[PDB]
């Protein structure tokens, strides 16, 4: 299907405890592949997927260089923002940055993004034309002006439409067995009495990849949106994902209920019934 490469960066100040904590991670789709942690022993960009381990010392040294530079700039950024917002030196604050690219079915560029948050709120974002900025307030408009005069959108556009996409494709190819797979959910249903007059029916989707899925309950064909307990999709830890949806069913009505499963691994959506 579609694919994405994204990098995520968190920088957190911690006053009276020296240097800001810096964490960087990279994903292709729902698969993490690199990390850097500023409090770790190594001080290196490190592999987190088997298919990126084959990249040579040039890759690893180049990524380590860039990531240690980012660490430094975000440390400066934290002071800058504290200055913009008139904040005291004694409080802990968070800058987050995320960028990357989307490709379609045919591995051709679909969209690029490059966005920052300060203290969990949108701060500045590259718009979809990759040429202009959304700035939240006066502080972020301060940043926008710096970036327009340094032509930051231009360099970012070149990266997002070229290099990003090129490297996404290489990773896709190199990690074919992991990244280009589609794992259909393994599904089952459980039934548990909560009283003598009610039971929970729970429809499970297990070991699926990628993470995108729709799980819904119907009663005589009408959606039970308001009455379904639905958990957030969650990582199993082996590179696959899980989800369940549950309904409370008055005893004797189990056959009215259907669980519906859509995932890119399923040729046709599944309909499951307790019977």
């Amino acid at each position: 299907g579609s694919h994405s490469m994204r990098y995520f960066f968190t920088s957190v100040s911690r006053p009276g405890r020296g240097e800001p904590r810096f964490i960087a991670v990279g994903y292709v789709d729902d698969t993490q592949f690199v990390r850097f942690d500023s409090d770790a022993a190594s001080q290196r960009m490190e592999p987190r997927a088997p298919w990126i381990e084959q990249e040579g010392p040039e890759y690893w040294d180049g990524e380590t260089r860039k990531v240690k530079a980012h660490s430094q700039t975000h440390r400066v950024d934290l002071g800058t923002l504290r200055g913009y917002y008139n904040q005291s030196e004694a409080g802990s604050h968070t800058v987050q940055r995320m960028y990357g690219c989307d490709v379609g079915s045919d591995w051709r560029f679909l969209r690029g993004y490059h966005q920052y948050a300060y203290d969990g709120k949108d701060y500045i974002a590259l718009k979809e034309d990759l040429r202009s900025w959304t700035a939240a307030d006066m502080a972020a408009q301060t940043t926008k002006h710096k970036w327009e005069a340094a032509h930051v959108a231009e360099q970012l556009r070149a990266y997002l439409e070229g290099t990003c996409v090129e490297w996404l494709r290489r990773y896709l190819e190199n990690g074919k067995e992991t990244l280009q797979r589609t794992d259909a959910p393994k599904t089952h249903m459980t039934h548990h009495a909560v009283s003598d007059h009610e039971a929970t029916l729970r429809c499970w989707a297990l070991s699926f990849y990628p993470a995108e899925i729709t799980l819904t309950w119907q009663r005589d064909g009408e959606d039970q949106t308001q009455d379904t307990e639905l958990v957030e999709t969650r990582p199993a830890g082996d590179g696959t994902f899980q989800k369940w949806a549950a309904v409370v069913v008055p005893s004797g009505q189990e056959q009215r209920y259907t669980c519906h499963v859509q995932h890119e691994g399923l040729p046709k959506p599944l309909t499951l019934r307790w019977e």
């Binding site: 890759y59 180049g62 990524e63 860039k66 950024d77 970036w147």
Partner: peptide, 9 residues
Amino acid sequence: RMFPNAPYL
């Protein structure tokens, strides 16, 4: 592969 820079805020 990352973008080379983080532009200062």
